[PDB]
From TrEMBL, chain A:
PANTHER family: OXIDOREDUCTASE 9.5 KDA SUBUNIT, PUTATIVE (AFU_ORTHOLOGUE AFUA_5G08980)-RELATED (PTHR38488:SF1)
Domain of life: Eukaryota
Positions of region (Disordered): 59-77
Protein name from the UniProt record: NADH-ubiquinone oxidoreductase 9.5 kDa subunit
Organism: Chaetomium thermophilum (strain DSM 1495 / CBS 144.50 / IMI 039719)
InterPro entries: Nuo9.5
TrEMBL record, chain B:
Highest taxon of the lineage: Eukaryota
Protein's UniProt name: Oxidoreductase-like protein
Region of the whole protein represented: 699 to 772 of 883
Protein family: Belongs to the complex I 23 kDa subunit family.
Length: 77, 74
């Protein structure tokens, strides 16, 4: 009566959607996460939705030698 | 279990239908499962009662109906 996945793959999927809905659509939703990772991000870069730069979580020290400032000295105090 | 004489016309049930012979769309069938639609209907019937007049009598100020034939104390 109830089908067999490896004999009739499409026919099992209809029975499982109808007869085991919570179980079937659990595996469906779980697969959508792997799909959404694969699909939206490239399409986002196609439409020009650039990912935001990361926010600073430490003091942003610039690279290179020190600039040799002149100003705001003890005499100015 | 059935009366004597010829069995009733179509007394015997039809053969059972397999799951894929049933006439109910997967969309209708799956939606009714996850949305719990028949339970939603019953909860709605209680809202209908909520806004209907109650049946209650304030006793002892209001009494229930008794006929002339009522049988009380002698
Ligand atoms: C995360 C974990 C998710 C697990 C749930 C996946 C759905 C499920 O239970 O599938 C079995 C479920 C039950 O079908 P069935 O035909 O009643 O199972 C008995 C058979 O003998 C079928 O027996 P089988 O051993 O041939 O198939 C069982 C196994 C398939 O196992 C294999 O054939 C090899 C094992 C694969 C391991 C992958 C690890 C990663 O199916 C999977 O779990 C496939 C997952 C991908 O449907 C499938 O076979 C789906 C396969 C795709
Ligand atoms: C306001 C409205 C909500 C108020 C409270 C409602 C509580 C409802 C609780 C119902 C629990 C029913 C139950 O025990 O399981 C029924 C069933 C899951 O069990 P299963 O063996 O698959 O039965 C198939 C036929 N019913 O089917 C189910 O209940 C599964 C339906 C999915 C539940 C919600 C999931 C998100 C959508
Ligand atoms: C890719 C396709 C999606 C992956 C599969 C989605 C999950 C679908 C439901 C998973 C189980 O699907 C089905 O569940 C019912 C539970 O009664 C079982 O079906 C069967 O179980 C036992 C066999 O072991 C039988 O005695 C029983 O008559 C029959 O119902 C099996 O466990 C499985 O065939």
């Amino acid at each position: 009566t109830t089908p067999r996945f490896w004999s009739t793959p499409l026919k099992y999927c209809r029975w499982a959607a109808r007869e085991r809905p919570a179980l079937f659509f659990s595996v469906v939703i779980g697969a959508l996460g792997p799909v959404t990772l694969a699909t939206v991000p490239p399409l986002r870069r196609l439409i020009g939705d650039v990912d935001a730069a990361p926010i600073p979580l430490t003091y942003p020290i610039p690279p290179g030698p020190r600039k040799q400032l002149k100003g705001y000295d003890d005499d100015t105090e | 279990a059935t009366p004597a004489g010829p069995p009733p016309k179509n007394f015997r049930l039809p053969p059972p239908k397999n799951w894929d012979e049933e006439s109910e769309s997967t969309i209708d069938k799956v939606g009714k499962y996850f949305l719990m639609t028949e339970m939603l209907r019953g909860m709605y019937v209680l809202l209908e009662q909520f806004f209907r007049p109650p049946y209650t009598i304030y006793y002892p100020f209001e009494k229930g109906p008794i006929s002339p034939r009522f049988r009380g104390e002698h």
